């Protein structure tokens, strides 16, 4: 079975992200590497997780660095299990992490893009926007949205995320609910991403990320871009995880269902994010012959138990993962009087 990593983006944040997973060494220690990338900008991601609050879930610079950082740690945990991926797909803000998991991005270069990406956009002081996940074919959008309310996220064949003016959205949902249509809002803290609203932010952000990402590394054929139409995947842009590629991600539409097309039929898909947002979408858009697995559940009493749970699930799937990599070695030889094994190996007699 192919192993496919899926990196969910925004709306994913919540108060308490991986305060529980902090106990695991491989996790903390990766989250501290992030603090080290971010020290010169005087910002400590571990403080951002520990002093969480509605306000910081809304700060787009706290939110970008929080997500990207946690994902990067989750990916580290997954490598700890001895579980590298066969396929990779990002979903907006996701692609940051992905390029880390694809290896064309440093941990630092990653953590620091999230930061600027977030920063420029906040300082650009854009105009009040808002996003929402809506169950309509990509085409049922172009036909039915008030002007200035683009489609921006193509999730399933029949579920898309529209982006647009905050005023415009509010009354377009008092207007949509009334018809019994699918509408889950998403936390963007006021900004409409993957729309035209971003063109404003394109210049100044690009110029700055050009200083973080020198020099571009090659992206591998394992990573299916969701910011670039499958058409020009052999392009000059799509070839390297460059500053230019980063800004593009934030500006173009997220061609997700597009990429999900390429996932094989016996595959296991893991959502690498602080919250399993794309469970709805993945389970629908993809075969019923594929198993889909969350890593963290928001508001959970203890993500430690829940992640382990799902790592267990990864086993029941058929993947080769090994929990001993999460915790410190054991001192072999085993203690004398440690339980026999042979006697509990029962067969099909």
Automatic annotation (TrEMBL):
Protein's job: Fatty acid synthetase is a multifunctional enzyme that catalyzes the de novo biosynthesis of long-chain saturated fatty acids starting from acetyl-CoA and malonyl-CoA in the presence of NADPH. This multifunctional protein contains 7 catalytic activities and a site for the binding of the prosthetic group 4'-phosphopantetheine of the acyl carrier protein ([ACP]) domain.
The protein's name in its UniProt record: Fatty acid synthase
Organism in which the protein naturally occurs: Sus scrofa
Range of the intact protein held here: 490 to 838 of 2512
């Amino acid at each position: 079975r192919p192993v496919w990593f899926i990196c969910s983006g925004m709306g994913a944040q919540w108060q308490g992200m991986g305060l529980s997973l902090m106990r695991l060494d491989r996790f903390r220690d990766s989250i501290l590497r992030s603090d080290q990338a971010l020290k010169p900008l005087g910002l400590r991601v571990s403080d951002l997780l520990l002093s969480t609050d509605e306000a910081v879930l809304d700060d787009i610079v706290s939110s970008f660095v929080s997500l990207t950082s946690i994902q990067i740690a989750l990916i580290d945990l997954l490598t700890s299990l001895g579980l590298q991926p066969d396929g990779i797909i990002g979903h907006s803000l996701g692609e940051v992490a992905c390029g880390y998991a694809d290896g064309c991005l440093t941990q630092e270069e990653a953590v620091l893009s999230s930061y600027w990406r977030g920063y420029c956009i906040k300082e650009a002081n854009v105009l009040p926007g808002a996003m929402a996940a809506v169950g309509l074919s990509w085409e049922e959008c172009k036909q039915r949205c008030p002007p200035g309310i683009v489609p921006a996220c193509h999730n399933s064949k029949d579920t898309v995320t529209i982006s647009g003016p905050q005023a415009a959205m509010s009354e377009f949902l008092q207007q949509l609910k009334r018809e019994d249509v699918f509408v889950k809002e998403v936390r963007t803290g006021g900004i409409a991403f993957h729309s035209y609203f971003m063109e404003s932010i394109a210049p100044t952000l690009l110029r700055q990320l050009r200083k973080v990402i020198l020099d571009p590394k090659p992206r591998s054929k394992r990573w299916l871009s969701t910011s670039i139409p499958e058409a020009q995947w052999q392009g000059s842009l799509a070839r390297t995880f460059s500053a230019e590629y980063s800004v593009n991600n934030l500006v173009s539409p997220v061609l997700f269902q597009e990429a999900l097309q390429h996932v094989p039929a016996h595959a296991v898909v893991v959502e690498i994010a602080p919250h399993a947002l794309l469970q709805a979408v993945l389970k629908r858009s993809l075969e019923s012959s594929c198993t889909i697995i969350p890593l963290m559940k928001k508001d959970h009493r203890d993500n430690l138990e829940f992640f382990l749970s799902n790592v267990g699930r990864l086993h029941l799937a058929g993947v080769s993962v090994n929990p001993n990599g999460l915790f410190p070695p054991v001192e072999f030889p085993a203690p004398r009087g440690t339980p026999l094994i042979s006697p509990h190996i029962k067969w099909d007699h």
